Design a protein around this ligand. Structure first.
Ligand SMILES: [Ca+2]
Length: 224
């Protein structure tokens, strides 16, 4: 997250860290045993870390659980990042408490102008790299599809939407990938991609979770 602020400890119970030796992507807990993330965050072996704030220090509220099954969307396109969404089943159900809980699925697509909360342990700089130990937060509005397409001519598909500021300065970034975009208490998006980070006229592009509600429900029911 570039230009954001440090979130209050455990204030985003649904935020998870995907770890493969080190943190590499974010995710969202939507059920005791299921996490939503980005398909480009796929890896053969993944440990899901819940209840985290400072990813380098043991705080006492963490829950480390290995993934038993990783399901990328059938139509995921590695080249265009179309349908960039993935489901992760935990080997065991997470213990739900005050610092670890789930986020709801959207009941309608994101509306332009809506303020959302994006979070992660991703890069905090537009140039160079500075990965934070503590979870970062950013409040940003959903942009119109018009503005989104204008920023990325011929690269925006039906599964994508933009959130951020055209003036730049505030945006998600590398390793925030797979993380949540929550608006009005619902998971509206998944951090997917963008050109640079917080650059002018290059807002973040996110996967529209609403388009996959049925797929998520069916896939989970068939693998639980
Ligand atoms: Ca920790």
């Amino acid at each position: 997250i570039v230009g954001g602020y440090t979130c209050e400890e455990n204030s985003l119970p649904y935020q998870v860290s995907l770890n493969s030796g080190s943190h590499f992507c974010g995710g969202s807990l939507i059920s005791e045993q299921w996490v939503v993330s980005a398909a480009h965050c796929y890896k053969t072996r993944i440990q899901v870390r819940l209840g985290e704030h400072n990813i380098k220090v043991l705080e006492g509220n963490e829950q480390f659980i290995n993934a038993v099954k990783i399901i990328r969307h059938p139509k995921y396109n590695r080249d265009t990042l179309d349908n960039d969404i993935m489901l992760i089943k935990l080997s065991s159900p997470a213990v739900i408490n005050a610092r670890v809980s789930t986020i709801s699925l959207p009941t309608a697509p994101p509306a332009a102008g809506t303020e959302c909360l994006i979070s992660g342990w991703g890069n905090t700089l537009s140039f160079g790299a500075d990965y934070p130990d503590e979870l970062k937060c950013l409040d940003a509005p959903v942009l119109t599809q018009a503005e989104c397409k204008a920023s990325y001519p011929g690269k925006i598909t039906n599964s994508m939407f933009c959130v951020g500021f055209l003036e730049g300065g505030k945006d998600s970034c590398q390793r925030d990938s797979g993380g949540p975009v929550v608006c009005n208490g619902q998971l509206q998006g998944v951090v997917s991609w963008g050109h640079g980070c917080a650059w002018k006229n290059r807002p973040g592009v996110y996967t529209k979770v609403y388009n996959y509600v049925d797929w998520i429900k069916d896939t989970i029911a068939a693998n639980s």
